[model samples]
Target: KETAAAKFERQHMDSNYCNQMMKSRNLTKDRCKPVNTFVHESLADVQAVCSQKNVACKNGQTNCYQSYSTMSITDCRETGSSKYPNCAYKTTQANKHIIVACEGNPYVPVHFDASV
Candidate 1:
């Protein structure tokens, strides 16, 4: 079972950044997440953005921050045929400085906000 907090990692952090192995490694219960993103960069690298000056998130929250460097990342979107328990995903990769929302006192990326 994936913890709610852990989803942050599953959804955003991934240094090795495997692809379809997600489907292979997944045995967790529930629906095929529609859209997901993973940073090819290390957790510390991504988390470092939390220390950057804050910005407004799309939702109007000011907890978000943009990355200083363009890092490799993968964006995953489930296909129309991405049925439950067999979520088929189309993974796209790019090098970019992205935006993300931070949380906690020390701050860490908890949400992928956007890219540039």
Candidate 2:
């Protein structure tokens, strides 16, 4: 099973990060994701979120965590006209504290909350 950390990297790392990760992670078989986010914080910092206070996910999951301070991240949004086999994305970087959902026995971040 792919870990949540690896999934995050696949979704939100860099311009070419998705291209490589999507194929390697087998997320490119059916359709490409339209939008995704990646945190630029260290893996240790990201993992530490699990110990932070809990919050509600956008989807209503209660296992989410919000960082205490702003962190660097990159948002990847697909262009309107992009087609399959030619996934195109526009990358934008920002400084925003993040919220993420943790799950499973080990408790790792699995979803990205809105940046503020």
Candidate 3:
């Protein structure tokens, strides 16, 4: 059986949905205004969290720190232009529909069902 991480990878998890949802909400990616992901949370701290769970960190591919109940994995990348160049972007967005899977919980769909 495939691990949860492997399943996520096979599903091609990405942040484009957030970008599209933002656009539908009359907000563009640029307008999303990159926020500091490291607020009270450092990448090393996040890695430590995962390490404690004995989960292999998928470098440049997963950020499990975003998980609410359990350690959530999100895709992370470093951009020289960002204020904190080493911080990881959640790929999860607010004010929009977000598909999230919590530990031992089915995927939850959070978004406005209204059409534009």
Q: How many residue pairs clash in each candidate?
A: 0, 0, 5
Deviation in angstroms for 84 in model 1? 1.5
Clashing pairs in 1: none
Window of ten residues with lowest summed lDDT in model 3: 107-116
Which candidate has the top score in TM-score? Answer: 1
TM-score comparison, 1 vs 3, better candidate: 1
* Candidate 3 segments whose C-alpha is farther than 4 A from its true place: 1-15, 36-68, 71-116
lDDT of 2 by residue, 1-116 (tens): 66776776566443276455555645665787787776777777877887886788888878889888888987767779768988777777789978887787777777777777
On lDDT, the stronger of 2 and 3 is 2
Give per-residue CA lDDT, model 3, range 47-101, as digits (tens). Answer: 2333232221234323222332332333223234534222323453222212222
Worst 10 residues of 2 by lDDT: 12-21
Please say which candidate is ahead in TM-score: 2 or 3.
2
Off by over 4 Å in 1: 1-5, 16-21, 24-29
For model 2, what is the alpha-carbon lDDT of residue 12? 49
lDDT score for residue 23 of model 2:
54
Estimate every model's Cα lDDT from 0 to 1. 0.74, 0.73, 0.29
